[PDB]
């Protein structure tokens, strides 16, 4: 048989409280103002740097990056402007040299009139490497010049629990 699809609000209502109350915007992040203020200023400065979020479990790193991408682009343009890779993905040196580099060199997706009228829409895309501390040293080394060369259209965000794992 088949079941009628549930609404997003109804689905979230019956989710575990950790997922149900995940912050939806930067104002909902609780006690990370020393960084959240800097991130919020980018909505106007439009010069977001490469980011390395690091901290112990359950402090709000993934929530913070998701909320930042939402605020920057909007629910319509986020997907086209974001490439997310985490520990559940393949992230070998070949992947870094081909897929990540190919996405980094692409022209940014075209914003619509509504997107421009309602969101900052900075002229760059975002590559999120969550759980970056699981990546090998050689794969990390393959990212060095890619980050610098295509910084005009791409910005990287690495997230980790153990900062020493990052070269």
């Amino acid at each position: 048989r088949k079941i009628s699809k549930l609404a997003a609000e109804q689905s979230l209502a019956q989710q575990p409280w950790v997922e149900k109350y995940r912050p939806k915007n930067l104002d909902e992040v609780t006690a990370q103002d020393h960084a959240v203020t800097v991130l919020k200023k980018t909505l106007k400065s439009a010069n977001l740097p490469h980011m390395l979020f690091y901290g112990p479990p359950g402090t709000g790193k993934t929530s913070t990056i998701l909320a930042l991408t939402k605020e920057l682009y909007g629910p319509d343009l986020m997907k086209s402007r974001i490439l997310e890779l985490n520990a559940s993905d393949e992230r070998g040196i070949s992947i870094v040299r081909e897929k990540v580099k190919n996405f980094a060199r692409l022209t940014v997706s075209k914003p619509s009139k509504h997107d421009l009228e309602n969101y900052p829409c900075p002229p760059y895309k975002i590559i999120i490497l969550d759980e970056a501390d699981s990546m090998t040293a050689d794969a990390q080394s393959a990212l060095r010049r890619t980050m610098e060369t295509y910084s005009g259209v791409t910005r990287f965000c690495l997230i980790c629990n153990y900062v020493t794992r990052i070269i």
């Binding site: 060199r105 692409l106 022209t107 940014v108 295509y150």
Partner: protein
């Protein structure tokens, strides 16, 4: 689908143009202006430069409101182009500050439409105005003859020596299993001018080129039945194939003589 719209009466033509240099360069910036389209790309080894020009006369319809640069990967473009048939018109469509280029194959007789999209890329390569040069020697000959000579001499060696002297062109190749030398002299036929071999020498010339680059260059013989070669000691060799309203040019650097 307004800013840039260019119509090819036959998609086969554009497919041939792309095939002429898709094996030389991989990443190309096509600059479209009100006067037409121009592309210029340097291969990875930095030894060969490809320069393509297509005028408005090559198109049934052409409208480019403002100049636009489109960065493309030639392999992907060739893959999309091989989809079209030989009886379909091909429309290239782009919008303001585009992120992609639309290729539209149309068959009015069968009322069939096929639309493909290719995402563009941020290529930070600036077109380099190739200043005109006074070449020591200028020759022209049928494309098939030059391609045959190149393919025959590439079997023997990885380097081919071209020497121009008074009314004579010699192609030499010395290798491990033997050597080969082909002599061609200027000649004109009034019954078959397309087969004429023409030479004009101000100074003698002697250059050496990599065989693989010449093998790639000769792939442009499908665009023009004749090929022109301009050679100078202090300049790169220029191989030109003439299109109806444009041209395809290969600037090849010779090997260091040492």
């Amino acid at each position: 689908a307004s800013m840039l719209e260019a119509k090819f009466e036959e998609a086969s033509l554009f497919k041939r143009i792309i095939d002429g240099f898709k094996d030389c360069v991989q990443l190309v910036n096509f600059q479209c202006k009100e006067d037409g389209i121009i592309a210029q790309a340097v291969d990875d080894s930095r030894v060969l430069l490809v320069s393509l020009e297509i005028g408005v006369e090559a198109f049934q319809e052409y409208r480019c409101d403002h100049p636009v640069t489109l960065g493309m990967d030639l392999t992907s473009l060739s893959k999309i182009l091989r989809c079209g048939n030989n009886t379909d018109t091909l429309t290239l469509i782009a919008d303001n500050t585009p992120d992609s280029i639309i290729l539209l194959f149309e068959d009015t007789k069968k009322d069939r439409i096929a639309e493909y999209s290719l995402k563009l890329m941020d290529i930070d390569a600036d077109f380099l105005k190739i200043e005109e040069l006074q070449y020591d020697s200028t020759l022209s000959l049928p494309s098939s003859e030059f391609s045959k000579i190149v393919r025959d001499l590439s079997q023997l060696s990885d380097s081919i020596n071209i020497m121009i002297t008074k009314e004579t062109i010699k192609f030499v190749a010395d290798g491990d299993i033997g050597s080969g030398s082909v002599i061609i002299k200027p000649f004109v036929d009034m019954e078959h001018p397309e087969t004429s071999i023409k030479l004009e020498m101000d100074q003698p010339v002697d250059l050496t080129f990599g065989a693989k680059y010449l093998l790639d260059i000769i792939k442009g013989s499908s665009l023009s039945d004749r090929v022109g070669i301009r050679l100078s000691s202090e300049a790169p060799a220029l191989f030109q194939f003439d299109l109806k309203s444009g041209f395809l040019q290969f600037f090849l650097a010779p090997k260091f003589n040492d």
